Design a binder for this molecule. Structure first.
Ligand SMILES: *O[C@H]1[C@@H](O)[C@H](n2cnc3c(N)ncnc32)O[C@@H]1COP(=O)(O)OP(=O)(O)OP(=O)(O)OC[C@H]1O[C@@H](n2c[n+](C)c3c(=O)[nH]c(N)nc32)[C@H](O)[C@@H]1O
Lengths: 346, 152, 747, 51
């Protein structure tokens, strides 16, 4: 399993997955008398856990593709060989954690300690450790998960403070955002942490360092999808729901984002909006939500009515394409209640 | 003889804060701080009454005076105060044991004060509150909300 | 002298957690000291003496070091023994008996390190126990010498008994004979609990004797003390021993002050931690050593709460113990120690918070268990300790979002309101409201506890309603309100008040209307009330210029602010400070029939103790000023080698005499009123055939005891007056018992 | 015997709040002094904005 070969590791991981699944099926409970087979295999289950944590595969694949018209687009691959590898590793590690979570937590804590003290410090090792931490989301009880995640986030913040340089800080911050975005239950439980995370993402959205804006938008859309219901209701200590706060300052949040990042932000906000059960409040939110695209749309329509030749101006066509992309993303996020917006421009 | 280790008093040492409006050099301000009986208390909720401060800080000794910090324009509480004791020992005890504890569920901070003067109870921020309040970007329900420079 | 600082740092560094083992660090330090010995010999001796005196917790770590040095240099060991004996003599001369016991323990341990011959130590302890045979000396002297003998046994007892068995048996017989005839009058005054179950609060010497007897039964074998020198048994066997010169204890002089007797705080037993390591028993030397070391650690790092907590959690022991329980018990023993805690009370609250933060997994749960145990044992708890418990618990809840399992205390709802449990709950809720607002306290507790919640701190005005039109002075009260609202000066207020009808130089109605109006109009905040008092200082002085005037001012102020005890306290303090009233007036008001219903409440005694503290501080300040003036005059006379200076000194001396007279009169008045009320209650109970022991009687007698305990040093000066005039043999035995216990405290 | 974890739960919540506060002042440009403890605020960003 230590060989740096993808196919050999895939065979070994197939065996490890089979073993973990069999042991879990025998008895899913954690550390009554230990099951016979688990008793036989106990001496090396921690070695398997260490292997899983030390060689975790990248959770997602991102590809830059040129469209038919020449548009450069970032796309997520759905079901490839590498994604399947990550899924198998995650399933194995989840089974092992279900067998006992103390050992997995100990291994993760040791890896994080070695990252902090500098003995095993590197971007690759930190990324692998954070992927391993994220993969086991939901495998442990809520209280143990909360304690473990609080400790991990505190240690990661300390590491970010201690490390010097823009690149190291960016890597550590991206890792923290990835970890918090992988534990929606944690954010749902604590409103202050969720609001702090979202405000940090908005702050990062103005960061021009390469990859920070994309990471912020991806984390924001992930949190919005998973914790949509917490942006429309009124939270303790708040005067208005967070959706109104975001919509009021939407112009200042996306002033630095690129058009694709703006489309992602609009999709996330639409996911948040779609959770509003009340019809009237939802309609008002939708109207307030498309205001910025609608202003440009109306200006372009009036210009065209005055003179259709404006539709031959390349800049007007780019603006129309951007507006329609925003509308498509908003429709995807919102769903049926988006009809009104469509009815406004159809 | 005495042991240096047993003499450690890190909790009553001068902080890095120096009042920029003090009419004197750094040496004079440090000299006044070294023998001061007054403590600046910060990170208070805007709804913290002077009675609660009295109750909390009377645990360290007898309180001589409490001067609540106020908005320069609005003249309302802006989350800080000054507590002057009768003796330096009580101020030292407050710095040792009241510093870093909770008042209205907020970790309050105590610092040595070179001495109260008229007009020092007003915030020095542009909006009339404390400079930190206008310079902070987080949300604080106990301190009004977002920073005055941000304001949502 | 960077070399001296480096040597001091090296000596103080040993014993702290480090990568290398303790033995390796000790050997390296001994080698370095030997290498640098010829030059900095005196500095090294002084540093070793200092650490022996000031770091008892590391006792065995340093004795071993000396032994190693003694192995390489006989002369150095002899000189160190001589220096230690000289330091012990100085400490005994200076009345520093705690440092003396630390030095005695250090020498006893040095006996184990083959630095001191056992016969010399046995002779020294024979002298220590012979001190008990003296005549016409106070029992505290004999008690301390016996305690210094016994408390060193955990370290050197095996060696002393295996070397000199007959001498040790003789010394033990003498000690037992002395202990059998000791006086135990001070015990009830110093007991946190008077209930024998589940943990008797035993006298410290009796507890030490029982522990030493248990150690003797167990072949002088103990399983807690760390003994690093054993690892150097080969090296220390070849070292030559020294003989202590015959030690003569200093004779008892008139100006000799001895430590007060103690009672051992005990609340935990092994059954309280069934899952962890077995807790040493109450009568085990391991418990004594653990508590002593933890107390010493707290004493060494009291200023730094974080360092103190780190030292407490990392406390090393030979065998695993339930360390969290021991730490909690030691902290609560210090907090509840009578007469007074070793340090300020808030320090203990902050230290407990730091410990909870450092060990969040286990320490908070142990603290909650300890709080529940303390609550369940409130029936016999001492009132002083109950007040400390209330203050700590309210301050702690203030730091933990006021979260508590109030339902577990539901029994307090079914008891008489004056019972210790409902009374404790009410006081805790009042103190919590003092740190918050009324609505928060109403919210946090269950609805079934609503009856025990504090009342709204709202002012009461006699001239606010319409039905008061018939009340005397109503028109004058309205005129005064208008005048105050219009910023009327002192002359206008006097002119307005001149129309008040006198019922008969002291007008009760005039004071009533003025005080009520002024307090009602300034009821917004404490600062407003202080400003109002300062502005109308002349009116207050002119009106309440007599004793009856001051009493009526206090009565009216209480009537206005009956529902805001904190306001009453601050107002009384400010009035005393600005001289509106005097300590005698406050003392008389405390015992007045108007405060009879609030007599047992905490704020009354808080006010009384604040007044006494203010009087003491005033006397101390005046004495310090006189001493400074005398020193300045002496310095001026010496430099020159005056009449105005002599007159100033005379005026200061008579001011000192007046302040002392006022302090003595205050204490005399307090004692007189206490005796009067207690005698009245006792006579009534005897006449009606009622049990003397009632909640009111318990509170009153324990408050008299608290008065004696808090200011025992000052009250000692008035011993002749108290014995001759107030606490006479004719007094009822119940009251006289408190005075007898106070006398026995230092006799 | 049951264990009373009320203060343990409160302390866990307070630790979570402290971690959230630490995350709030998280940055990627420079180091912010912690000499003011609970009164710490981003003064470098404030200076940048004021300019
Ligand atoms: O540039 C400003 C501020 O951003 C900068 N600053 C802020 N934080 C730091 C740190 N950590 N290191 C270096 N520089 C920093 O300093 C400039 C002034 O900011 P600040 O000192 O926070 O404001 P200031 O204290 O001058 O105004 P304000 O707080 O409104 O004063 C009102 C009143 O309170 C007294 N006071 C405030 N503070 C924070 C005090 C303190 O820490 N200690 C004492 N004794 N008094 C304090 C003010 O002096 C006034 O009396």
């Amino acid at each position: 399993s230590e060989v740096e070969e993808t196919e050999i590791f895939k065979i070994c991981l197939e065996y490890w997955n089979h073993l973990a699944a069999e042991l879990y099926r025998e008895s899913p409970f954690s550390t009554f008398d230990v099951p016979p087979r688990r008793q036989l295999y106990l001496p090396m289950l921690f070695k398997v856990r260490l292997l899983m944590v030390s060689r975790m595969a990248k959770p997602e694949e991102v590809l830059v593709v040129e469209n038919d018209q020449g548009e450069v687009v970032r796309e997520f691959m759905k079901d490839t060989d590498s994604i399947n590898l990550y899924k198998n590793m995650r399933e194995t590690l989840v089974y092992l954690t279900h067998l006992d979570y103390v050992d997995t937590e100990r291994i993760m804590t040791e890896k994080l300690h070695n990252q902090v003290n500098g003995t095993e410090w590197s971007w690759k090792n930190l990324n692998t450790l954070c992927w391993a931490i994220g993969s086991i989301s939901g495998a442990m009880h809520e209280e143990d998960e909360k304690r473990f995640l609080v400790t991990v986030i505190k240690d990661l913040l300390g590491l970010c403070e201690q490390k010097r340089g823009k690149d190291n800080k960016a890597i550590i911050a991206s890792n923290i955002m990835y970890i918090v975005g992988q534990y929606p239950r944690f954010l749902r439980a604590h409103w202050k942490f969720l609001k702090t995370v979202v405000n940090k993402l908005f702050e990062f959205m103005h960061e021009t360092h390469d990859g920070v804006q994309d990471m912020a938008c991806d984390t924001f859309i992930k949190i919005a999808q998973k914790c949509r219901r917490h942006f429309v209701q009124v939270q303790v200590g708040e005067v208005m729901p967070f959706i109104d706060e975001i919509l009021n300052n939407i112009n200042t949040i996306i002033c630095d984002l690129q058009p694709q990042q703006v489309h992602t932000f609009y999709e996330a906000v639409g996911y948040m909006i779609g959770a509003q059960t009340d019809q009237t409040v939802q309609e008002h939110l939708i109207e307030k939500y498309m205001l910025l695209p609608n202003q440009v749309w109306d200006s372009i329509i009036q210009q065209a009515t005055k003179n259709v030749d404006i539709l031959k101006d390349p800049e007007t066509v780019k603006q129309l394409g951007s507006i329609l992309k925003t509308n498509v993303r908003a429709c995807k996020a919102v769903g049926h209640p988006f009809v009104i917006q469509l009815g406004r421009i159809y | 003889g005495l042991l240096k280790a047993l003499r450690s008093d890190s909790y009553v040492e001068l902080s890095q804060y120096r009042d920029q409006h003090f009419r004197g050099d750094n040496e004079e301000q440090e000299k006044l701080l070294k023998k001061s009986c007054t403590l600046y208390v910060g990170n208070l909720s805007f709804y913290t009454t002077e009675e609660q401060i009295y109750e909390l800080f009377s645990k360290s000794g007898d309180i001589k005076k409490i001067i609540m910090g106020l908005d320069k324009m609005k003249k309302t509480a802006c989350g800080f105060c000054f507590v002057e004791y009768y003796s330096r020992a009580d101020a030292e005890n407050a710095m040792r044991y009241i510093n870093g504890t909770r008042l209205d569920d907020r970790i309050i901070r105590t610092d040595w004060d070179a001495g109260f003067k008229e007009g020092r109870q007003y915030g020095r921020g542009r909006s009339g509150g404390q400079v930190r309040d206008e310079y902070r970007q987080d949300y604080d329900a106990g301190r009004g909300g977002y920073g005055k420079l941000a304001q949502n | 002298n960077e070399t001296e600082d480096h040597l001091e740092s090296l000596i103080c560094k040993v014993g702290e957690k480090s990568a290398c083992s303790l033995e390796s660090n000790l050997e390296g330090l001994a080698g370095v000291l030997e290498a640098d010995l010829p030059n900095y010999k005196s500095k090294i001796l002084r540093l070793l003496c200092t650490v022996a005196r000031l770091l008892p917790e590391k006792l065995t770590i340093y004795t071993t070091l000396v032994g190693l040095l003694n192995a390489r240099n006989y002369n150095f060991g002899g000189e160190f023994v001589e220096a230690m004996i000289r330091q012990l003599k100085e400490s005994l001369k200076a009345n520093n008996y705690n440092e003396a016991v630390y030095l005695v323990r250090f020498l006893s341990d040095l006996v184990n390190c083959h630095v001191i011959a056992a016969p010399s130590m046995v002779a020294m302890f024979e002298n220590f126990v012979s001190v008990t045979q003296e005549e016409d000396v106070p029992q505290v002297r004999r008690d301390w010498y016996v305690y210094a003998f016994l408390s060193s046994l955990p370290w050197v007892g095996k060696e002393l008994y295996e070397k000199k068995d007959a001498e040790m048996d003789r010394i033990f017989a003498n000690t037992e004979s002395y202990l059998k005839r000791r006086q135990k009058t001070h015990v009830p005054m110093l007991q946190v609990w008077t209930a024998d179950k589940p943990h008797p609060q035993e006298e410290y010497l009796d507890c030490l004797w029982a522990q030493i007897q248990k150690l003797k039964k167990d072949r002088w074998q103990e399983r807690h003390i760390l003994r690093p020198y054993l690892a150097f048994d080969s090296i220390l066997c070849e070292a030559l021993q020294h003989n202590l010169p015959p030690f003569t204890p200093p004779p008892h002089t008139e100006d000799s002050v001895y430590p007060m007797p103690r009672v051992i705080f005990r609340m935990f037993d092994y059954t309280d931690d069934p899952e962890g390591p077995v807790m040493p028993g109450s009568h085990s030397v391991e418990r004594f050593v653990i508590e002593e070391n933890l107390h010493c650690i707290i004493k060494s790092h009291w200023k730094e709460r974080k360092t103190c907590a780190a030292q407490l959690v990392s406390y090393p022991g030979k065998n695993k113990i339930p360390l969290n329980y021991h730490i909690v018990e030691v902290i609560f023993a210090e907090l509840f120690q009578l007469p007074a805690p070793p340090h300020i009370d808030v320090m203990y609250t902050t230290l407990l918070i730091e410990l909870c933060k450092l060990q969040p997994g286990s320490l908070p749960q142990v603290l909650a268990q300890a709080t529940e145990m303390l609550y369940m044992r409130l029936d016999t708890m001492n009132t002083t300790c109950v007040d400390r418990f209330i203050n700590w618990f309210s301050h702690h809840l203030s730091n933990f979002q006021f979260r508590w399992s109030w339902e577990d205390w539901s029994d307090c709802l079914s008891q008489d309101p004056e019972s210790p449990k409902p009374k404790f709950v009410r006081e805790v809720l009042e103190k919590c409201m003092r740190l918050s607002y009324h609505q928060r306290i109403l919210d946090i507790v269950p609805p079934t506890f609503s009856a025990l919640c504090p009342a709204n701190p709202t002012c009461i005005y006699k001239y606010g309603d319409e039905s008061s039109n018939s009340l005397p002075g109503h028109s004058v009260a309205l005129c005064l309100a208008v005048a105050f609202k219009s910023k009327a000066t002192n002359d206008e207020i006097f002119s307005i008040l001149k129309d008040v009808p006198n019922p008969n130089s002291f007008n009760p109605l005039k004071i009533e209307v003025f005080v009520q109006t002024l307090l009602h109009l300034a009821a917004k905040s404490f600062s407003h009330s202080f400003s109002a008092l300062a502005k109308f200082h002349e009116v207050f002085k002119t009106l309440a210029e007599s004793d009856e005037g001051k009493l009526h001012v206090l009565r009216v102020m209480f009537e206005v602010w009956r529902n805001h005890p904190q306001m009453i306290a601050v107002l009384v303090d400010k009035m005393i400070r600005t001289q509106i009233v005097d300590c005698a007036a406050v003392a008389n008001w405390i015992f007045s029939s108007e405060l009879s219903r609030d007599f047992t409440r905490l704020f009354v005694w808080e006010i009384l103790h604040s007044t006494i503290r203010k009087m003491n501080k005033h006397v101390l300040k005046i004495q310090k000023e006189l001493e400074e003036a005398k020193e300045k005059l002496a310095r001026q006379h010496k430099r020159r080698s005056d009449g105005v200076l002599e007159e100033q000194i005379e005026r200061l001396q008579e001011k000192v005499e007046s302040a002392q007279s006022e302090q003595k009169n205050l204490f005399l008045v307090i004692f007189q009123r206490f005796i009067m009320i207690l005698t009245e209650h006792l006579v009534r109970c005897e006449t009606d055939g009622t049990s003397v022991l009632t909640p009111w009687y318990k509170n009153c007698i324990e408050r008299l005891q608290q008065i004696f305990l808090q200011h025992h040093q000052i009250i000692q000066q008035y011993m002749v007056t108290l014995e001759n005039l107030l606490f006479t043999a004719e007094l009822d035995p119940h009251i006289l018992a408190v005075f007898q216990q106070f006398c026995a405290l230092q006799a | 015997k049951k264990i009373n974890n009320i203060w343990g739960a409160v302390l866990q919540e307070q630790n979570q709040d402290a971690v959230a506060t630490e995350l709030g002042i998280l940055g990627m440009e420079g180091t912010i002094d912690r000499s003011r403890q609970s009164e710490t605020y981003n003064y470098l960003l404030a200076k940048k904005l004021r300019k």
